[PDB]
Design an enzyme around this catalytic site. Sequence first.
Site, PDB file in Angstrom:
ATOM      1  NE  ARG A 291      24.764   8.524 -23.825  1.00  0.00           N
ATOM      2  CZ  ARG A 291      25.215   7.512 -24.553  1.00  0.00           C
ATOM      3  NH1 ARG A 291      25.923   7.773 -25.646  1.00  0.00           N
ATOM      4  NH2 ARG A 291      24.923   6.261 -24.213  1.00  0.00           N
TER       5      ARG A 291
ATOM      6  CB  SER B   7      27.456   5.700 -32.089  1.00  0.00           C
ATOM      7  OG  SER B   7      28.612   4.894 -31.983  1.00  0.00           O
TER       8      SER B   7
END
Lengths: 244, 241
Positions: free
Chosen positions: A228, A50
Amino acid sequence: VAKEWQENKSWNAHFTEHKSQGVVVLWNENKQQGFTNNLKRANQAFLPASTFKIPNSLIALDLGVVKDEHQVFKWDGQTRDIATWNRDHNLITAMKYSVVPVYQEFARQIGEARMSKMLHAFDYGNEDISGNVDSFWLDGGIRISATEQISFLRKLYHNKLHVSERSQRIVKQAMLTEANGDYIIRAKTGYSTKPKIGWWVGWVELDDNVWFFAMNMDMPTSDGLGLRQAITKEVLKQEKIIPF
Amino acid sequence: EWQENKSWNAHFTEHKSQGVVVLWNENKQQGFTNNLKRANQAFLPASTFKIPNSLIALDLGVVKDEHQVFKWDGQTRDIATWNRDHNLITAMKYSVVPVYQEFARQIGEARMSKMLHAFDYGNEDISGNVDSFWLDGGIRISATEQISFLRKLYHNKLHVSERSQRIVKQAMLTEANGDYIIRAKTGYSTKPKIGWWVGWVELDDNVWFFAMNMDMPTSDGLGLRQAITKEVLKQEKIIPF
């Protein structure tokens, strides 16, 4: 010799503290210097997943596939597992909720030839769109490294990509993730299921500097998706880029 | 179209303050205020004028872009953050009057006057020094008039380039998280002592414009501008608690 890149292995503690493995790459725009915990992995190329919504948005805006950031892409009426996808979106919300089917439809409208040409024009990773035109960034041939993400992002930041300034300004608006009195983060997450890789790429705007970042990490379970941002922020905090 | 909600007065009286908050629900085309009369009372815009001033400077090429550096002139001023180089983003953030005074001088009286007319901005009156009229001259604007102006900016409907409007909206960025985005500008007028906060809250599927002013006898209460506004936004379930 001017070492563009320097290794800071102390950042490995931020990965090992979560029994994780990955890389964080930082670029100090003022100093024109990069830092990473892993020089080799910094240059290893993966599926962008993405994170590809950044170039895909730019191309869709530049070709008029997307008119502006408010144009509505109506839900196609197929209920998907992710509830936030089962509604109308604009570019801002499509990015925010990482709404793959909106971007698949953009890719189909862009088409193979224009997609391929535009990624070449962007010097974007291996520029290879092999596979389905509407999923190659999830399961096809496109590959990009952390250092290559930073190169691409720096062009976007400076409005130097070969699309209109307007398109770049709109995408940067869509990438807005966090803002306060100390910093602004414009960024995009990514998650690839094969191999299991998590991304976060973007930058931190300060009063007098910009720090570009690109991180990827092994993501065996979706349980670690928040790592992340968390691991990246721990590095940004350690380097006094953002406060504790 | 307009509704009065006097319950918001609690957010002012909490701090022994007085003022007005005006909200506009863009989807519903409906306005709400705690004080209909004060909502229409016009004051010096003070640093809220940085919004039209930026737009005009960008459109005339007085400012190239949001990264062009305006070097400190070397005069030390009381506000420490002013005594350094700035760009449009930091000049807005720190409300750096001398950068915007220099813009006003470059814009000049005739173009400034014409552009405020074109923007339908407040009383459109630039009487006084070209580089201070928004601080001590004849320009006056109300909260409802700020909203009118801001709605045009939001929709890119002002008579300047789309690019100029996009850059100013970037410069107005104040707060962003996963729940909302606030683009806004503070202002503080020393005579009379008035604090402003004007802007909007972007949600997934709506935008709420706001404009607030309050009596500001001391600079100690400047943080109330945002705090009181946020209490109203929270009460109206625009932003979470």
